[PDB]
Design a protein around this nucleic acid. Structure first.
Lengths: 101, 77
DNA sequence: CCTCATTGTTATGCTAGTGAAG
DNA sequence: TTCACTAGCATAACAATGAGG
């Protein structure tokens, strides 16, 4: 950390971006905690996630979890794109089956 | 004109059902109605709950789209 | 106004557990 | 046997809906 001002500004805007993404992907705070626990092997309670989204955590804990959340959002967005493509594919397949029936 | 918090999947399903149940048998208080609604919801399968959960997700997403600066603020007792 | 009654999401008050200084 | 922080565990608040205190 060069200075706490710019770093904490970047972190508090990253927190809003994180909340925005988790909302547009449909995860509850407990869901993010459970998935972080499952793909990194360390449990995270909904409480710590709420505190993170409220910038109510030690700056060291904020920066300690920021990379974890970045990997989590990468995997979540991959899963969302996968599900979206698969749903459209099955819809085209249903069109084929229904018109060909 | 105050912003209300978005409703989860249960509230969506219950809001759909209790209107029908009030039209069905009036003079029935929403207390017994809500007891019966929760008892019924507990018995539904995930296949049956899926669309209302997805509707609640869409509702929260649209809520943040409408009110980007919303923050749930209760009043502790 | 208010209370009820429900499940689910979110904020937070109260703990036990951890060091640090004297 | 003192103070500051840390992280869950719990549980209240509040969304809907309207009848009747």
């Amino acid at each position: 950390g060069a200075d706490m001002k710019a770093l904490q500004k970047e972190l508090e805007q990253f927190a809003k971006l994180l909340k925005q993404k988790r909302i547009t992907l449909g995860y509850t705070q407990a869901d993010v905690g459970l998935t972080l626990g499952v793909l990194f092997g360390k449990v995270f309670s909904q409480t710590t996630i709420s505190r993170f989204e409220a910038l109510q955590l030690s700056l060291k804990n904020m920066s300690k979890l920021r990379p974890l959340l970045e990997k989590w959002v990468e995997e979540a967005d991959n899963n969302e794109n996968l599900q979206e493509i698969s749903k459209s594919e099955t819809l085209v397949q249903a069109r084929k089956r229904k018109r060909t029936s | 004109d105050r912003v209300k918090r978005p409703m989860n999947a249960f509230m969506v399903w219950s809001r759909g059902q209790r209107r029908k149940m009030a039209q069905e048998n009036p003079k029935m208080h929403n207390s017994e109605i809500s007891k019966r609604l929760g008892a019924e919801w507990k018995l539904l399968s995930e296949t049956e709950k899926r669309p209302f959960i997805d509707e609640a997700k869409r509702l929260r997403a649209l809520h943040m789209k409408e009110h980007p600066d919303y923050k749930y603020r209760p009043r502790r007792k």
